[PDB]
Amino acid sequence: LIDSKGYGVGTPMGSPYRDKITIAILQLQEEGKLHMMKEKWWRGNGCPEEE
Amino acid sequence: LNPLSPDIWMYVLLACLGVSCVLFVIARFSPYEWYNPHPCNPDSDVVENNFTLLNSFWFGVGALMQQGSELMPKALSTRIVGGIWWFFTLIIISSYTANLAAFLTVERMESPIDSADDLAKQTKIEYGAVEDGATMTFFKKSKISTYDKMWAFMSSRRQSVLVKSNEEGIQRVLTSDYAFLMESTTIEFVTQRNCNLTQIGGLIDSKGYGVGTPMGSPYRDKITIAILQLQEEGKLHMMKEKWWRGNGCPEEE
Amino acid sequence: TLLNSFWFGVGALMQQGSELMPKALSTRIVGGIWWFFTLIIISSYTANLA
Amino acid sequence: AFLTVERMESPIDSADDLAKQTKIEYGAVEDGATMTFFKKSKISTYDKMWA
Amino acid sequence: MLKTGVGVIRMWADEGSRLSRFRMLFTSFVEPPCTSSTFFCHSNMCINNSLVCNGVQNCAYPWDENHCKEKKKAGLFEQITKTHGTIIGVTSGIVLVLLIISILVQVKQPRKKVMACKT
Amino acid sequence: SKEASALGVQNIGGIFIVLAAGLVLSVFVAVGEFLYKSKKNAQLEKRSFCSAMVEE
Amino acid sequence: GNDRFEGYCIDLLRELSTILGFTYEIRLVEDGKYGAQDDVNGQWNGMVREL
Numbered sequence: 001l002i003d004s005k006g007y008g009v010g011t012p013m014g015s016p017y018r019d020k021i022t023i024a025i026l027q028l029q030e031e032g033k034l035h036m037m038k039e040k041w042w043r044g045n046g047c048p049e050e051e
Numbered sequence: 052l053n054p055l056s057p058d059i060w061m062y063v064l065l066a067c068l069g070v071s072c073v074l075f076v077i078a079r080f081s082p083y084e085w086y087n088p089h090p091c092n093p094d095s096d097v098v099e100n101n102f103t104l105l106n107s108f109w110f111g112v113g114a115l116m117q118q119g120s121e122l123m124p125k126a127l128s129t130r131i132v133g134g135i136w137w138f139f140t141l142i143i144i145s146s147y148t149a150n151l152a153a154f155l156t157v158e159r160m161e162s163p164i165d166s167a168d169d170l171a172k173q174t175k176i177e178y179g180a181v182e183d184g185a186t187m188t189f190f191k192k193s194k195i196s197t198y199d200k201m202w203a204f205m206s207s208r209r210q211s212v213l214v215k216s217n218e219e220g221i222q223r224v225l226t227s228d229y230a231f232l233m234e235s236t237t238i239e240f241v242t243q244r245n246c247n248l249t250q251i252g253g254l255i256d257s258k259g260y261g262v263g264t265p266m267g268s269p270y271r272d273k274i275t276i277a278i279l280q281l282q283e284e285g286k287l288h289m290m291k292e293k294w295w296r297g298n299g300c301p302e303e304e
Numbered sequence: 305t306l307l308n309s310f311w312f313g314v315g316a317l318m319q320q321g322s323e324l325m326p327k328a329l330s331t332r333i334v335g336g337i338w339w340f341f342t343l344i345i346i347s348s349y350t351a352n353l354a
Numbered sequence: 355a356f357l358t359v360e361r362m363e364s365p366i367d368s369a370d371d372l373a374k375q376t377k378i379e380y381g382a383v384e385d386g387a388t389m390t391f392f393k394k395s396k397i398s399t400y401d402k403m404w405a
Numbered sequence: 406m407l408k409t410g411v412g413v414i415r416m417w418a419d420e421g422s423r424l425s426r427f428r429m430l431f432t433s434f435v436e437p438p439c440t441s442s443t444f445f446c447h448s449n450m451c452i453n454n455s456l457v458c459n460g461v462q463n464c465a466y467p468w469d470e471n472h473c474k475e476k477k478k479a480g481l482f483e484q485i486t487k488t489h490g491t492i493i494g495v496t497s498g499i500v501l502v503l504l505i506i507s508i509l510v511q512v513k514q515p516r517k518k519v520m521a522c523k524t
Numbered sequence: 525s526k527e528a529s530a531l532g533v534q535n536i537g538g539i540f541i542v543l544a545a546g547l548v549l550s551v552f553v554a555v556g557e558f559l560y561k562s563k564k565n566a567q568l569e570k571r572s573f574c575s576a577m578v579e580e
Numbered sequence: 581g582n583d584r585f586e587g588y589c590i591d592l593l594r595e596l597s598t599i600l601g602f603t604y605e606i607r608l609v610e611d612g613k614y615g616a617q618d619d620v621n622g623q624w625n626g627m628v629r630e631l
């Protein structure tokens with residue numbers, strides 16, 4: 001990795017939903033929901049030919 | 052010396068002194084090895100024998116190291132001793148060089164644990180975490196099929212495995228048989244200084260640090276514009292390579 | 305000779321026996337320990353060659 | 355390596371090896387409890403096999 | 406983990422629950438300046454070192470009942486015994502008898518003059 | 525496990541039999557050469573009992 | 581008759597008949613079908629329809 005940044009749900013400047021998304025995202029990754037959705041879309045035929 | 056057992060290296064040596072003394076006695080006893088040494092003078096009586104005890108012993112050593120000596124038996128009684136010592140040393144060498152392929156590259160002795168579920172089954176390797184931590188709070192409040200089972204241990208043995216620092220989590224691994232669940236940025240510092248500790252799994256979850264302000268403070272925006280200004284300029288990586296540098300540690304292969 | 309001594313050492317290195325198998329026990333030990341040397345060097349070579 | 359190395363195994367070995375490998379074609383019978391099983395199940399592979 | 410030096414425990418076995426069983430092992434431990442006769446467990450324990458190699462563990466981990474097993478071992482001396490020594494006891498003497506005969510044939514009998522069928 | 529435990533007398537094992545059952549076979553034919561030469565030494569002469577003491 | 585037929589489920593019905601005790605007439609289903617929810621008519625077909 002050249003740098004390290006991340007994906008943020010953009011809200012307009014002053015939106016009250018920003019904290020309501022901030023607390024919410026922290027809930028899914030401790031329940032494990034952000035990891036189970038990550039494994040579901042970033043998985044395919046992971047090159048079994050070099051072996 | 053490994054691919055044959057230290058007793059069966061002695062059964063070769065007793066056979067190498069055994070057969071080399073049986074071949075000598077038979078070659079003197081047999082009335083067909085006693086030949087005429089003069090071809091050009093056939094009708095004389097100088098009938099000799101080319102099996103001495105040097106000649107018999109470095110037949111048994113010569114046919115063992117696959118090079119061979121001059122010393123070729125001529126009677127049928129000594130071509131059965133020599134012919135079965137060649138089949139003996141064909142099987143010894145072929146069994147040696149086939150087992151030696153398994154004592155040079157077979158595998159590395161891996162750790163018995165490799166991930167989170169390998170701690171979930173193997174109750175021999177003891178768990179561990181820190182008291183008053185976000186790691187202990189993570190297993191206390193998660194329920195997905197392993198991390199309740201990992202907290203099924205640590206709740207029952209809370210006075211045993213749960214420690215009061217990251218320093219005591221290092222020492223229990225250096226001394227006891229312990230599998231301390233540390234956060235992955237002080238595993239990337241301790242394993243740089245101590246080349247005898249390692250990160251045996253991946254990352255269980257993903258979270259991050261913070262410059263935490265009180266609830267409703269006029270700084271949680273002024274700090275993150277300052278943090279992202281330090282991150283686009285790369286100044287949060289000159290600060291991490293400064294402290295997490297370590298004394299260097301070999302991968303070695 | 306010094307030519308025939310180096311043709312023993314190259315010969316016994318390649319598993320191909322030469323024409324001059326030593327007499328005289330002091331030279332049979334040199335020839336005998338060079339046979340065990342080149343036995344281990346080749347059988348470690350051909351076992352790691354795979 | 356040319357006497358004992360392995361047997362040439364099938365490219366598929368289970369249900370999920372059909373779920374990835376779109377080269378090997380599926381199949382079932384019309385008016386069957388097998389077709390009805392994939393039509394009404396949803397556990398992460400058997401909807402994809404009915405997809 | 407009690408705090409005082411007095412421990413009171415009881416069993417209530419009023420009827421057929423009488424067959425219930427339990428056995429304990431208390432261990433007198435001191436605050437963690439362990440100085441003498443005190444193998445320091447890393448669980449706030451200073452136990453007495455008379456309870457070493459006793460089999461019964463006193464701390465959570467078996468700290469005290471650990472690394473008390475010492476022997477001596479070797480290579481082919483692993484099998485030097487009554488049972489496996491039957492082969493090495495005889496066959497090392499068979500080679501020795503063959504080597505006394507082979508000197509006797511070499512010294513008393515030369516290889517050259519006229520010696521057909523000789524020994 | 526595809527690990528160690530190097531070869532012993534349980535693995536190779538039986539070439540120490542076929543060696544020892546090959547030398548004992550060769551002692552019996554060493555006597556058979558000692559007898560068949562005595563018949564060829566009986567080409568001229570006696571019943572080959574005095575030759576077994578002198579030659580040996 | 582029913583002497584046209586053989587098989588596992590004819591050897592079974594001969595041995596259910598010696599236990600219970602009944603006479604039976606084998607009639608093949610005329611749909612040539614087992615049974616399924618049509619989800620248009622909402623009806624069943626095949627052997628389930630004749631039950």
Ligand SMILES: CCCCCCCC/C=C/CCCCCCCC(=O)O[C@@H](COC(=O)CCCCCCCCCCCCCCC)COP(=O)([O-])OCC[N+](C)(C)C
Binds near residue numbers: 057112333478479480
């Ligand atoms: C031409 C001939 C040339 C020969 C060259 C020989 C040169 C050899 C030179 C070697 C130098 C070695 C240096 C270290 C020594 C330590 C030994 C060791 O590790 O023991 C290990 C096993 O040991 C055994 O199993 C014993 C086997 C018997 C020895 C066989 C001799 C070979 C005979 C020849 C046959 C051929 C005869 C003819 C064949 C026809 C284990 O022991 P340890 O308890 O772990 O060690 C304690 C260490 N401490 C005290 C420090 C704690």
Ligand SMILES: CCCCCCCC/C=C/CCCCCCCC(=O)O[C@@H](COC(=O)CCCCCCCCCCCCCCC)COP(=O)([O-])OCC[N+](C)(C)C
Binds near residue numbers: 103104508515
């Ligand atoms: C590390 C290495 C180990 C391997 C070595 C083992 C093999 C070595 C054995 C070699 C045996 C000798 C063979 C020589 C050829 C016979 C010719 C002859 O008769 O003359 C010989 C006379 O000497 C003798 O007659 C025999 C006395 C030598 C000792 C006998 C064996 C002792 C074994 C103990 C050690 C074995 C234990 C083995 C342990 C593994 C030679 O004499 P000369 O000086 O040439 O002069 C000629 C005199 N002449 C005119 C009267 C003839």
Ligand SMILES: CCCCCCCC/C=C/CCCCCCCC(=O)O[C@@H](COC(=O)CCCCCCCCCCCCCCC)COP(=O)([O-])OCC[N+](C)(C)C
Binds near residue numbers: 135543
């Ligand atoms: C081109 C050369 C041809 C050579 C012929 C080869 C073909 C022969 C094959 C024939 C077919 C195989 C059957 C053999 C008999 C079966 C019985 C059996 O179970 O084995 C038994 C006997 O057998 C032996 O001892 C080994 C075989 C013969 C001795 C060595 C071979 C010849 C020696 C040199 C020939 C040179 C002469 C050549 C001509 C002058 C072994 O078991 P055991 O004794 O009970 O051991 C104890 C039990 N234990 C191990 C659990 C401790």
Ligand SMILES: CCCCCCCC/C=C\CCCCCCCC(=O)O[C@@H](COC(=O)CCCCCCCCCCCCCCC)COP(=O)([O-])OCC[N+](C)(C)C
Binds near residue numbers: 062073499547549
């Ligand atoms: C001239 C003779 C003297 C000179 C010879 C050279 C001198 C030196 C020679 C060799 C030195 C090395 C020692 C030899 C034995 C060591 C190996 C061993 O362990 O025992 C082996 C054989 O032992 C037996 O069980 C006895 C069977 C017969 C052996 C004798 C052959 C007779 C041939 C009869 C037929 C003739 C027919 C002929 C015509 C075809 C196997 O034993 P084991 O049960 O496997 O061991 C148990 C271990 N385990 C439980 C882990 C498995």
Ligand SMILES: CCCCCCCC/C=C\CCCCCCCC(=O)O[C@@H](COC(=O)CCCCCCCCCCCCCCC)COP(=O)([O-])OCC[N+](C)(C)C
Binds near residue numbers: 127
């Ligand atoms: C390319 C490699 C080298 C090629 C060599 C090929 C040669 C042929 C080799 C083998 C042919 C025999 C076929 C056996 C296979 C079946 C198994 C079997 O029955 O084994 C039987 C024995 O069998 C033996 O032991 C055979 C030993 C023969 C040694 C021949 C050396 C020739 C030397 C020539 C010198 C003369 C010079 C002449 C001078 C003029 C019994 O075994 P088992 O019962 O099945 O299992 C064990 C169970 N048990 C322990 C209870 C007994």
Ligand SMILES: CCCCCCCC/C=C\CCCCCCCC(=O)O[C@@H](COC(=O)CCCCCCCCCCCCCCC)COP(=O)([O-])OCC[N+](C)(C)C
Binds near residue numbers: 083127549553560
């Ligand atoms: C299971 C049994 C247990 C007990 C065993 C006890 C049984 C023992 C049985 C017999 C003991 C005695 C037999 C041998 C005696 C003399 C033979 C000889 O040396 O050659 C003679 C004839 O031989 C030939 O040259 C032609 C026939 C070939 C025979 C050998 C073939 C090897 C095959 C393998 C089969 C081998 C048969 C044995 C099988 C073991 C002479 O021929 P020559 O070359 O002209 O002589 C040299 C003269 N020159 C210097 C002028 C050139």
Ligand SMILES: *[C@@H]1O[C@H](CO)[C@@H](O[C@@H]2O[C@H](CO)[C@@H](O)[C@H](O)[C@H]2NC(C)=O)[C@H](O)[C@H]1NC(C)=O
Binds near residue numbers: 225227
């Ligand atoms: C070999 O590995 C062991 C780990 O199993 C090293 O650590 C020892 O572990 C025991 C308990 O398992 C503790 O007493 C100490 O942590 C260590 N003891 C000693 C004497 O060092 C051990 O250090 C390693 N090295 C050697 C030479 O044994």
Ligand SMILES: O=S1(=O)NCN(C2CC2)c2ccc(F)cc21
Binds near residue numbers: 005
């Ligand atoms: O853009 S951020 O919010 N702030 C910058 N960083 C850390 C400095 C690496 C990170 C690291 C991981 C992220 F997912 C997000 C961010």
Ligand SMILES: O=S1(=O)NCN(C2CC2)c2ccc(F)cc21
Binds near residue numbers: 257259
């Ligand atoms: O705790 S966070 O603010 N939100 C959760 N995550 C990502 C979901 C992995 C991350 C990832 C990297 C971070 F630095 C912080 C966080």
Ligand SMILES: C=C(C)[C@H]1CN[C@H](C(=O)O)[C@H]1CC(=O)O
Binds near residue numbers: 181186187216232
């Ligand atoms: C040292 C301790 C207890 C702290 C350090 N930061 C984490 C935190 O502040 O949550 C903890 C590590 C852990 O939870 O394993």
Ligand SMILES: C=C(C)[C@H]1CN[C@H](C(=O)O)[C@H]1CC(=O)O
Binds near residue numbers: 383385388389614
């Ligand atoms: C042949 C067919 C359609 C029938 C046979 N019995 C099953 C049934 O009666 O449901 C079906 C097989 C299947 O579903 O693959």
Ligand SMILES: *[C@@H]1O[C@H](CO)[C@@H](O)[C@H](O)[C@H]1NC(C)=O
Binds near residue numbers: 245247
């Ligand atoms: C790790 O443990 C072993 C035992 O002494 C050794 O390789 C090394 O010295 C230790 N690491 C450090 C940093 O001392």
